[PDB]
Amino acid sequence: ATKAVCVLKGDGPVQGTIHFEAKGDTVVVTGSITGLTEGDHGFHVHQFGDNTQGCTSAGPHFNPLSKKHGGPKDEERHVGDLGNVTADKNGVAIVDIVDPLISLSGEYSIIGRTMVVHEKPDDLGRGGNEESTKTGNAGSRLACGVIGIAK
Amino acid sequence: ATKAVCVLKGDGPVQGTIHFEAKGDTVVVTGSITGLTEGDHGFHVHQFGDNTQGCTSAGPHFNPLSKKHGGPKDEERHVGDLGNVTADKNGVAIVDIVDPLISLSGEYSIIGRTMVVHEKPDDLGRGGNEESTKTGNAGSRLACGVIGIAK
Ligand SMILES: [Cu+2]
Ligand SMILES: [Cu+2]
Ligand SMILES: [Zn+2]
Ligand SMILES: [Zn+2]
Numbered sequence: 001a002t003k004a005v006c007v008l009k010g011d012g013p014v015q016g017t018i019h020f021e022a023k024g025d026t027v028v029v030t031g032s033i034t035g036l037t038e039g040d041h042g043f044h045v046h047q048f049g050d051n052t053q054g055c056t057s058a059g060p061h062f063n064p065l066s067k068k069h070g071g072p073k074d075e076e077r078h079v080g081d082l083g084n085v086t087a088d089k090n091g092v093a094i095v096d097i098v099d100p101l102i103s104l105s106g107e108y109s110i111i112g113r114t115m116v117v118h119e120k121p122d123d124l125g126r127g128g129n130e131e132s133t134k135t136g137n138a139g140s141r142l143a144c145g146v147i148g149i150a151k
Numbered sequence: 152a153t154k155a156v157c158v159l160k161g162d163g164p165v166q167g168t169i170h171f172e173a174k175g176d177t178v179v180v181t182g183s184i185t186g187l188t189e190g191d192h193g194f195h196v197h198q199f200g201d202n203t204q205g206c207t208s209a210g211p212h213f214n215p216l217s218k219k220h221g222g223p224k225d226e227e228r229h230v231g232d233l234g235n236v237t238a239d240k241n242g243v244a245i246v247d248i249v250d251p252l253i254s255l256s257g258e259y260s261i262i263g264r265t266m267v268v269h270e271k272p273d274d275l276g277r278g279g280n281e282e283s284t285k286t287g288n289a290g291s292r293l294a295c296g297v298i299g300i301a302k
């Protein structure tokens with residue numbers, strides 16, 4: 001697929017539609033998430049597209065290369081590290097990311113995996129603690145969805 | 152990619168969890184669906200893992216070989232044609248299917264696509280009207296979910 005889509009849903013007020021498009025050796029991510037508290041929220045691709053137990057069953061951050069948690073710009077990051085999405089006072093976050101590590105095909109494709117938007121911001125592996133270089137301290141999983149093939 | 156899972160959700164009471172496992176050269180599908188009316192219900196893999204408009208956006212049945220709709224045992228069928236699941240009087244349908252066309256990797260992969268359970272029985276393409284050759288007259292989509300990679 002050169003195109004993918006993900007519908008984020010959770011137990012609370014957070015929902016959103018995320019679009020993915022392959023361009024060169026990058027994936028352009030677009031869309032929006034509504035119902036968010038003003039400010040930043042971690043935005044990551046988790047390993048499994050398993051929603052049997054809410055967003056918890058999605059597992060760890062997609063990390064096929066076995067590296068530590070970082071920000072999208074860092075060389076030392078998990079493939080699923082897409083940084084933070086920023087919500088305005090109205091609680092809407094317009095997503096716009098161009099990532100060079102995630103892919104929509106091949107060994108480490110993200111199709112069939114889970115997109116997760118977190119409760120708190122992602123400190124990009126710079127919080128100092130140990131929960132910083134594993135998840136970036138983004139908190140619980142507000143909404144999530146399995147990444148699917150799009151027309 | 153040897154295991155996959157799908158959580159079926161809809162506007163109504165129908166829900167269920169479907170499991171997929173690559174065993175040998177085939178794919179074993181198991182699980183259960185609840186909240187169904189007693190009797191048969193179409194059970195298919197639709198082309199897109201797009202839930203932006205409910206089960207509607209999933210598109211037509213997955214059909215990479217460009218064939219007409221049929222039953223799972225027919226030569227002429229869509230790759231996504233898994234026939235009917237049968238609900239007992241308590242509204243529970245136990246899924247136990249092994250299928251020769253679907254796969255969890257490559258050209259026939261259903262990872263990232265949508266599993267749908269229909270309101271009415273699939274006539275296995277033998278209804279005699281044009282609709283039979285497309286959807287088996289299975290009708291509306293009661294519940295669906297994107298097929299994701301499982302641990
Ligand atoms: Cu995360
Ligand atoms: Cu169908
Ligand atoms: Zn990470
Ligand atoms: Zn069909």
